[PDB]
Amino acid sequence: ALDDIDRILVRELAADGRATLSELATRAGLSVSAVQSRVRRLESRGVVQGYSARINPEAVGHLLSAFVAITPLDPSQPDDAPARLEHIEEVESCYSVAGEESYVLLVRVASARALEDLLQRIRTTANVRTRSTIILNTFYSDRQHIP
Amino acid sequence: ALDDIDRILVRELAADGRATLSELATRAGLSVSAVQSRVRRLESRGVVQGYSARINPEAVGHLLSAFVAITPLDPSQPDDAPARLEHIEEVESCYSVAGEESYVLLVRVASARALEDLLQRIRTTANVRTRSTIILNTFYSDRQHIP
Ligand SMILES: N[C@@H](Cc1ccccc1)C(=O)O
Numbered sequence: 569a570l571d572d573i574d575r576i577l578v579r580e581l582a583a584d585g586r587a588t589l590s591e592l593a594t595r596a597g598l599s600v601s602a603v604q605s606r607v608r609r610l611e612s613r614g615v616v617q618g619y620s621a622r623i624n625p626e627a628v629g630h631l632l633s634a635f636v637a638i639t640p641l642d643p644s645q646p647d648d649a650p651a652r653l654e655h656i657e658e659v660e661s662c663y664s665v666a667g668e669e670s671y672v673l674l675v676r677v678a679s680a681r682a683l684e685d686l687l688q689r690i691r692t693t694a695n696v697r698t699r700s701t702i703i704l705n706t707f708y709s710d711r712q713h714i715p
Numbered sequence: 716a717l718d719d720i721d722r723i724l725v726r727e728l729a730a731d732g733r734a735t736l737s738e739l740a741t742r743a744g745l746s747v748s749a750v751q752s753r754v755r756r757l758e759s760r761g762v763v764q765g766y767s768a769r770i771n772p773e774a775v776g777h778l779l780s781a782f783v784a785i786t787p788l789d790p791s792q793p794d795d796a797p798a799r800l801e802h803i804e805e806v807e808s809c810y811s812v813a814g815e816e817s818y819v820l821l822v823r824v825a826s827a828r829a830l831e832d833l834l835q836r837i838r839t840t841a842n843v844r845t846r847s848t849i850i851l852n853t854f855y856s857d858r859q860h861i862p
Contacts, residue, residue: 575775578775581767581768581770582770585765585766585767585768586732586733614771614774615771615774615775618732618768618769619732619766620728620732620767620859621729621764621766622765622766622767623729623763623764623861624762624763624764627761627762628725628861628862629862630862635814635819650855657858657860659858660858660859660860661853661854661856661857661858663850663852663856665848665851666848666850667848671854672850701813701814701819702814703811704811704813705810705811706808706809707797707810708797708801708808709808710807711806711807712767715776
């Protein structure tokens with residue numbers, strides 16, 4: 569239940585999250601009221617989860633990023649790694665994954681030594697072994713596709 | 716230098732990219748003309764890179780996400796895989812990495828069947844071998860942290 573109009577709306581809003589209701593109304597052939605109300609239904613049905621500025625991580629002092637794959641030191645202990653790691657602010661994302669590892673994290677940090685301290689924090693807070701893959705360059709990211 | 720009132724602004728806009736320049740000014744303690752001019756300057760030094768609505772991928776038909784680690788088949792050839800894959804819309808992100816593979820992609824697709832098709836297209840269009848790690852669930856993503 570996403571009609572043609574809604575796909576247009578989410579496509580425009582993925583490319584430009586600050587687009588005004590009136591720019592959107594003219595692209596969709598709707599009134600500004602019609603647009604607001606379709607946008608409110610997109611948000612409350614959880615199709616649109618929120619809006620963010622895309623911040624350049626380097627510009628704010630995050631000069632090093634990494635994938636960290638984690639696996640429980642004790643797989644019989646309950647499985648709450650994501651909730652435990654939620655209070656660690658340098659953890660930007662957490663996915664559960666098929667394979668030998670349990671979770672993959674994306675982590676951002678100021679430097680190599682800051683990474684070594686963060687890995688210790690991640691091993692003790694989730695009781696986990698870590699396998700780190702350092703990112704050397706981001707060619708493009710977050711390019712959301714609406715088919 | 717990021718004039719740490721500037722840190723309040725990026726912090727606020729990362730959390731709510733549809734914040735208004737006036738509902739901002741009160742939260743930061745400035746005047747619409749200052750707020751507006753910083754934001755335009757932040758956008759000009761590529762600190763804020765865009766604004767986007769965060770779309771739920773499964774709401775839109777992408778019921779299968781995967782990391783796809785790729786490595787060029789022939790190292791005598793120019794390594795231009797990111798440029799070559801850029802036109803493939805199901806690739807959301809591309810990173811070079813220090814690990815076992817040369818690059819990691821984040822890919823989104825309708826089904827396991829559609830992934831197999833996509834992996835064939837990736838192999839033939841960029842001349843790479845692939846290795847996919849299927850995501851089961853996303854616990855949180857894109858929590859941009861501003862120190
Ligand atoms: N990696 C496990 C799935 C899993 C993820 C996270 C926690 C526990 C299990 C598998 O391939 O079956």
